[PDB]
């Protein structure tokens, strides 16, 4: 079984650059979706960006053009670049990998612990 | 801001002009503010603090201490008349401040779980107060929406609104949205009211007082509360002992008049008794215990709407949740296809949102790449009523799931592109709905119908299936491979829909299955376990498959390995008495309407046991209002349910359940301890002066003292009996009878004692200082400070039935150990107060005299220790 860890969550600046990454003990290569998933207080999660198994790149239209996704075999770990972070689009990110699947039904939906990110007008 | 009448003669384009209401896009956030500036908040003006407190004193037994006080002041008594007086206010000020409190705490909590509704301002959808409304305002109604203003509905795709809050039908009325010229309100849509069904949209014609039917929501706020049936019983129980309590004092006046006595002393000293005996502070305490219940199960984040709830959690035993939305967190998702060609897709992405692909043999499928992966998810898309706005589902999350995978494959705007001339819609009797419709670019077509629902509902009206794009006769083998995919989908957790289209009703072609996961909400399994593990029982009445219903419990832990489950059809088919039987023993109930949900929880309710119906839905609320207590979730709860619940859940926690069950338990035990201390204080007083009259010995008490005693015994020396803490031991207690039998025989016996002991030992006192032949003021007073200290042990041992008061300790309960010294200061100032001494009739007593009194006076709680010992030694 895949197991997630998250990782480079931290307080961070308007106008600055945050890194994220979420990584599994096994290689990523067969997983057709796996996206980042932005929940907050107050609202439903929402989503971050991800891609699909034709190597499109999906992004959610609230951070798009902002926000960069890249995956790479030899780090298992899939890799966020976030830049222009305003204080309103701040909250916890939680990391998710769906594996393709035939008799079986059961979901192979495996989510990460999350990291939090913070945000403060400035000042 | 408009009429209704006007609104309603008024077409769309008129009203959007007068309220200057951009439909598509909504008020700005300048122009929300410049309106709220004139217009302010949609709250009600202010809700009668002073008229609260005047209520109090319209209870019987607070009428009758003013008609004693009345007869005091006519037959002047000024100083009994005071004392009368005082007892009076001080009871009622601690049930008046108690009563604040506890609706002040309800208030607080209300704040955090407030009225809301959904605005489209900004061009962006969101989830707004109705508070904040101002006139012109866009709001677009759900399916169990509370409507939050008189709206001007624009869009009424389908529309049934309830209109039994307002009007008084219990009939749904449907909505046009076209203008009607000249109740009837067709296309009005009133503050208040809710939607049971489709979806719409409105501009708000009106704000604050000018809804149409703002009186009936102004008279539901000062509509008060009936009585609690504890709080009757308890009126009743001291109607009886007050009306025994005055047949014995009129035998006391009849023995004193022929014996020969001072009848003005007689009519004082049975006026005072008739006061004492009196229990004024039982309903008082009786509040006061269910007003400090509410705020403890408010600092457990558990809005109580009804009072009587609080009676009735502490005999809670059975919990029927409910499988959608209750026991799983709702946010169900489209992840697996069956085709009905055989094909199967597996739906990946999570939430509602367009961003997930579905994957067909590991290739990617768009548009209408596939044809039956396509129809299904058009049939999918066209039969909804649920929108998915700016990443905001507003339907139902099945209807929302469908909506987003229609957005994932791409096909969402074919909603668009069909006019729903007719609708047949859901109904959890039917368990489908369908919609006719025509395609707006071709006319030409028949009137294709879309259909969807559960499995065997929907092949019912099947005639036809797909195969590689051509209509084939339905078969037995096709829909044994179908019932076996809709087996194993459920098997593994997933809620699984059917859906077909077709020309007219009973000539469908079955397109494919559907496999929605709802995973169940977080920590559940634990309070489940913890709930069986004390002693309660919970069962998952649903209207879904055997087998999503059982996997789910599986999972949660209410369905072990070896345990039986029951469809609906089966409590159809079978009698009440056999109901009545099997009900305990099932689990898991699956494919259970309304009907058949109401029907186990009279079950439930006539095997003795008290029902808490966790439920949500539109059509559960019946069910919740038949429960003897209805939960709703707090964060995830229609309207709808919440207003037609009893207990909400604000932070959506089965373990706020428990926590409520336990704080509901010991209001009992507290209530019990106030009547044994009372009763037993009163009889000792009512023997003590039967027998100094019978037997013609002076009255060891006069009328003041009497009336000292009474504010001892129901003033706070008393009523901090009804504050005391509740120990561990009642908690793993099961749960008590329904019925009161608050006078238990074994509290009649301990009364008998007490008041035995006590009568013994003052009347020991009072022939110890009368063997003189002289009645000095030294043997009064003697006597009477005898009293109130056997007065206030016997209130330290009836701070608890069976827990040793050593254990306890005497700081545990401070308001009884404040009340304890305000009641020996007070003691002392009249032993010494020389204006005490002169109005009680009393004198000073040396500290020896106060020494042997003490000693005495640990008489009687030495023996109500050791009596609990010995029943703590034979329950062992
Ligand atoms: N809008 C809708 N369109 C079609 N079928 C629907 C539907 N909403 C619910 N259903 C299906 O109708 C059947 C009866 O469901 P019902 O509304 O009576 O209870 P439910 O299963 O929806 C939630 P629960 O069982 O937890 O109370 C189920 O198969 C459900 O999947
Ligand atoms: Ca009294």
Redesign the pocket.
């Known amino acids: 079984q895949v197991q997630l860890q998250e990782s480079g969550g931290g307080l961070v600046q308007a106008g600055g650059s945050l890194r994220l990454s979420c990584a599994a003990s096994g290689s990523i290569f067969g997983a057709d979706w796996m996206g980042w998933y932005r929940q907050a207080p107050g609202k439903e999660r929402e989503f971050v960006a991800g891609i699909g198994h034709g190597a499109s790149t999906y992004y959610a239209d609230s951070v798009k053009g902002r926000f960069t996704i890249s995956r790479d075999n030899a780090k298992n770990t899939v890799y966020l670049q976030m830049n222009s972070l305003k204080p309103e689009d701040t909250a916890v990110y939680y990391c998710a990998v769906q594996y393709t699947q035939y008799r079986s039904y059961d979901s192979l939906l495996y989510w990460g612990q999350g990291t939090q990110v913070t945000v403060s007008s400035g000042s | 801001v408009l009429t209704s009448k006007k609104a309603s003669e008024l077409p769309v384009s008129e009203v959007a002009s007068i309220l200057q209401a951009d439909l598509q896009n909504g008020l700005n956030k300048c122009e929300v503010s410049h309106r709220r500036a004139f217009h302010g908040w949609n709250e009600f003006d202010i809700s009668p603090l002073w008229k609260k407190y005047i209520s109090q004193f319209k209870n019987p037994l607070i009428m009758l201490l003013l008609a004693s006080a009345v007869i005091s002041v006519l037959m002047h008594q000024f100083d009994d008349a005071v004392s009368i007086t005082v007892a009076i206010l001080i009871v009622v000020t601690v049930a008046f401040v108690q009563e604040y409190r506890s609706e002040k705490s309800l208030e607080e909590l209300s704040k955090l779980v407030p009225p809301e509704c959904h605005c489209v301002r900004e061009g962006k959808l969101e989830h707004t107060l109705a508070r904040d409304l101002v006139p012109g305002d866009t709001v677009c109604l759900s399916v169990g929406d509370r409507v939050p203003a008189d709206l001007r509905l624009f869009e009424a795709v389908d529309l049934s609104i309830d209109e039994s809050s307002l009007t008084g039908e219990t009939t749904p009325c449907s909505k046009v949205t076209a203008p009607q010229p000249a109740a009837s309100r067709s296309n009005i849509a009133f503050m208040g009211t809710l939607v049971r069904c489709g979806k719409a949209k409105g501009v708000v014609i009106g704000t604050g007082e000018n809804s149409e039917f703002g009186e009936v929501f102004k008279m539901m706020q000062a509509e008060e509360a009936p009585k609690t049936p504890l709080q009757k019983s308890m009126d009743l129980l001291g109607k009886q002992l007050s009306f025994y309590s005055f047949g014995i004092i009129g035998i006391i006046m009849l023995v004193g008049w022929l014996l020969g006595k001072d009848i003005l002393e007689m009519f004082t000293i049975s006026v005072s008794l008739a006061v004492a005996a009196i229990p004024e502070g039982l309903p008082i305490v009786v509040t006061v215990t269910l007003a400090l219940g509410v705020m403890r199960m408010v600092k457990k984040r558990a809005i109580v709407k009804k009072l009587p709830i609080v009676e009735t959690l502490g005999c809670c035993n059975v919990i029927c949740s409910?499988?959608?939305?209750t026991l799983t967190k709702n946010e169900m998702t489209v992840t697996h296809i069956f085709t009905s060609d055989g094909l199967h897709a597996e739906v990946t992405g999570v939430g509602y949102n367009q961003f997930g692909e579905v994957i067909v043999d590991g290739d990617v499928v768009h548009g209408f790449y596939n044809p039956a992966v396509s129809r299904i998810v058009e049939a999918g898309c066209v039969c909804?009523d649920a929108v998915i706005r700016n990443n905001t589902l507003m339907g139902?999350p099945?209807?929302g799931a469908l909506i987003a995978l229609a957005m994932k494959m791409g096909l969402d705007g074919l909603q668009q592109d069909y006019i729903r001339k007719a609708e047949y819609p859901?109904s959890?009797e039917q368990?489908?709905?369908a919609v006719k419709c025509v395609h707006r670019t071709q006319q030409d077509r028949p009137e294709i119908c879309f259909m969807?629902?559960?499995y065997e509902q929907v092949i019912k009206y099947c005639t036809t299936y797909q195969s590689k794009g051509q209509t084939l006769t339905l078969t037995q083998q096709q829909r044994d491979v179908y019932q076996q995919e809709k087996a194993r989908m459920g098997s593994a957790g997933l809620?699984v829909?059917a859906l077909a289209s077709g020309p007219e009703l009973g000539q469908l072609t079955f397109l494919g299955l559907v496999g929605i996961i709802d995973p169940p909400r977080t920590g559940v399994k634990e309070a489940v376990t913890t709930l069986i593990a004390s002693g309660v029982s919970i069962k998952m009445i649903?209207?879904?498959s055997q087998e999503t219903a059982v996997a789910i419990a599986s999972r949660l832990g209410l369905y072990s390995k070896t345990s039986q489950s029951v469809s609906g059809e089966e409590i159809d088919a079978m009698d009440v008495q056999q109901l009545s039987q099997i009900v305990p023993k099932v689990a898991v109930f699956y494919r259970a309407?309304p009907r058949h949900k109401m029907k186990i929880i009279k079950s439930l309710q006539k095997n003795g046991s008290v029902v808490a119906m966790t439920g949500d839905?539109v059509?559960?609320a019946v069910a919740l209002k038949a429960a003897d207590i209805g939960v709703a979730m707090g964060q995830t709860g229609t309207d709808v349910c919440k207003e037609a619940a009893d207990m909400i859940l604000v932070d959506d926690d089965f373990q706020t359940i428990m926590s409520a069950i336990e704080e509901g338990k010991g209001i009992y035990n507290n209530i019990k301890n106030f009547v044994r201390f009372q009763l037993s204080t009163s009889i000792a007083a009512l023997t003590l002066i039967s027998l100094a009259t019978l037997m013609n010995f002076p009255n060891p008490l006069n009328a003041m003292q009497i009336l000292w005693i009474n504010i001892i015994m129901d003033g706070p020396p008393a009523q901090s009996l009804g504050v005391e803490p509740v120990d561990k031991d009642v908690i793993r207690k099961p749960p008590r009878n329904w019925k009161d039998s608050i006078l238990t025989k074994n509290l009649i016996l301990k009364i008998l004692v007490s008041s035995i002991i006590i009568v013994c030992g003052t009347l020991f006192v009072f022939w110890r200082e009368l063997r003189d032949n002289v009645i000095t003021p030294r043997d009064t007073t003697m006597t009477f400070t005898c009293f109130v200290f056997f007065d206030m042990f016997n209130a330290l041992s009836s701070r608890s039935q069976t827990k040793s008061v050593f254990e306890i300790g005497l700081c545990s309960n401070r308001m009884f150990c404040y009340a304890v010294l305000g009641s020996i200061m007070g003691q002392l100032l009249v032993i010494y107060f020389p204006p005490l001494q002169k109005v009680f009739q009393t004198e000073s007593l040396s500290i020896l005299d106060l020494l042997f009194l003490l000693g005495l006076t640990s008489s009687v709680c030495i023996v109500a220790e050791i009596i609990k010992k010995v029943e703590r030694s034979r329950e062992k």
């Open positions: 409910d499988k959608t939305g909804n139902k099945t209807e859901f959890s368990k489908w709905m969807k629902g559960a809620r829909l649903t209207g879904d309407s839905g059509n559960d």
